[PDB]
Structures are given as C-alpha cells and as structure tokens.
C-alpha cells in the first residue's frame, strides 16, 4: 500500500531550519534521538522489492534515470521545505547537467568536496565561482558500494533517504552545515549525481542546489518542474 511505502521524512516536534541555535542542549539531544528513531526504517512497498533487481550503472545512467534520481530526492526535500514554509525546488535539465558535471570532475579518490571540480562545473554551466569554497554541494560518502559500477535503484533510494535523515537530524559533528544548506531559503533548483570508480567502497552522492542568484547575469535559467509528492498528512487527512 501507498502509506506503508510512503518515504516522507517524519519531522520531530520543535524542528526548524535552525534548531541547533533555537533549542537548548537537552532539547537538541531529544529532537535528534526522536527523529533518528522515527526515521530508521526505509519505508518499502512491493514496487520497492522489484527495484532491488533494477540495476543502475552509476557512470552510465540514461537521461530518464538521472531525472528520476533528482525528482525522487527533490520530492523528499520539498516535503520538509514546504512544511517549514521554505521555497520549493525544481528539477531541470540545467540542474541535472550541472550536478553531473560536478560528479564527472570530482576526484574519485577524494572524500571531501572537490572545490576545483565544483567551480569548474559552475563556470561551464554559467554559475558563479567561489575560489576554494563550496556553496553548491552536500556530499554523502560511503552510503553504498559499486559492483562493476552497478547498484540497485532500491539501494540508491534507500541511501539517499538515509543521507537526508542524517543531514537533517544528525549533523552536529559537522556544525549543522548540511542542515542549514538543505533548508536554505530562496533555493529554487536541485540536481543529484553520483560518482565513483567501478569497484569502490567509497562512491558518492552529490546533492547540488541553489537559487537564481548563483547564475551569472548573462546565464540562461531554466524554470524546470517543481517536484511535489502528496504529504503523509494530506493522505491521512483524505481517509
């Protein structure tokens, strides 16, 4: 059924884009423990069991598979952003191409942001550069493995949701940079890409997001489509 398989992130009480400064130490601990518990199980439908035998080549994805990956991720994040009254994100050919350029240029041997790769991709896609800095990428490393460069669609969707849960509710050892970035107001676009050597215990998920103020003045912006799934609360309130 639709509800048992619904992959929406369950928000804890007192959640906000800046809970790390709004809440006390004791309330932060309680929020994070609650939220990680309430999101530990990847919600699975019979469609998801079949996705376990859909194998994706992370360095060979089709245009449709790239768009699916970005839409899946943007739906989950937009569900949280809409609850917090933040701007909703689009997926476009522009956001996908930018993300996959970052992935292609990123050093597969490197665990941290590849700022040279991000700025090179930015310049070629008409975005502003920030030499030595990264204001485009949230990176998840070590959430999955590539066998001959391949990984199931199920595994990628499972890893992406776990990555978002960890960035929204367990980001304190990284100073909440990912919490703040994923929930930054005024963002309008997201793309998701993947990188890694064929046989890697360290392939990556690149979440690329921005607003139109990151484009150079002359650069063409693509509105694309706002990714929106029905919320669990909307679905429950229908019944």
Annotation: binding site for Mg(2+): 178
Closer to Mg ion at the Cβ: 67 or 206?
A: 206
Q: Can you spell out the DSSP letters for the chain?
A: -TTTT--PPPPPTT--TTHHHHS-HHHHHHHHHHHHHHT-S----HHHHHHTT-EEETTS--HHHHHHHHHHHHHHHHHHHHHTTPPPPEE-HHHHHHHHHHHHHS-TT--S--HHHHHHHHHHTTBPP-TT--SSEEEEESS--BBTTEEEHHHHHHHHHHHHHHHHHS-GGGTTHHHHHHT-TT--EEEEEEE--SSBS--EEEEEEE-GGGB-TTSPP---EE-----HHHHHHH-
In angstroms, give the least distance from the CB of 123 to Mg ion: 21
Residue pair 28/14 in contact by the 8 Å Cβ criterion: no
Closer to Mg ion at the Cβ: 191 or 224?
A: 191
In angstroms, give the least distance from the CB of 97 to Mg ion: 21
Could you list the residues known to form a binding site, using ranges.
Answer: 178
Closer to Mg ion at the Cβ: 42 or 143?
A: 143
Nearest Cα neighbor of 167 from 230, 93, 99, 76 is: 76
In angstroms, give the least distance from the CB of 170 to Mg ion: 13
In angstroms, give the least distance from the CB of 228 to Mg ion: 25
In angstroms, give the least distance from the CB of 204 to Mg ion: 9
In angstroms, give the least distance from the CB of 138 to Mg ion: 5
Closer to Mg ion at the Cβ: 73 or 138?
A: 138
Closer to Mg ion at the Cβ: 138 or 195?
A: 138
- Which residue is nearest to Mg ion, using beta carbons? 139
Rounded distance, CA 132 to CA 162, Å? 28
Binding site for Mg ion (CB under 5 A): 138-139
Closer to Mg ion at the Cβ: 194 or 229?
A: 194
């Amino acid at each position: 059924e639709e509800l048992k398989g619904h992959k929406g992130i369950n928000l804890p009480p007192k959640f906000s884009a800046d809970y790390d400064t709004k809440l006390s130490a004791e309330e932060i601990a309680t929020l994070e423990k609650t939220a990680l518990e309430m999101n530990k199980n990847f919600p699975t439908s019979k469609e998801d069991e079949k996705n376990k035998d859909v194998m994706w080549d992370i360095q060979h994805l089709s245009a449709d598979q790239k768009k699916e990956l970005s839409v899946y991720t943007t739906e989950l994040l937009n569900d949280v952003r809409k609850k917090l009254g933040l701007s909703q994100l689009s997926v476009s050919d522009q956001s996908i191409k930018f993300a996959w350029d970052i992935a292609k240029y990123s050093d597969t041997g490197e665990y941290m942001h590849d700022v040279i790769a991000i700025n090179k991709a930015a310049k070629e896609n008409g975005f502003k550069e920030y030499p030595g800095m990264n204001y485009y990428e949230n990176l998840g490393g070590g959430y999955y493995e590539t066998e001959n460069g391949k990984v199931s669609k199920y595994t990628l969707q499972e890893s992406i949701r776990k990555m978002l849960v960890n960035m929204l509710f367990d980001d304190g050892r990284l100073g909440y940079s990912h919490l703040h970035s994923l929930l930054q107001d005024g963002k309008t676009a997201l793309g998701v890409s993947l990188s890694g050597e064929k046989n890697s215990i360290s392939p990556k998920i690149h979440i690329i997001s921005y607003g139109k103020e990151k484009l150079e003045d002359s650069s063409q912006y693509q509105n694309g489509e706002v990714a929106s799934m029905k919320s669990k609360e909307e679905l429950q309130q229908e019944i």
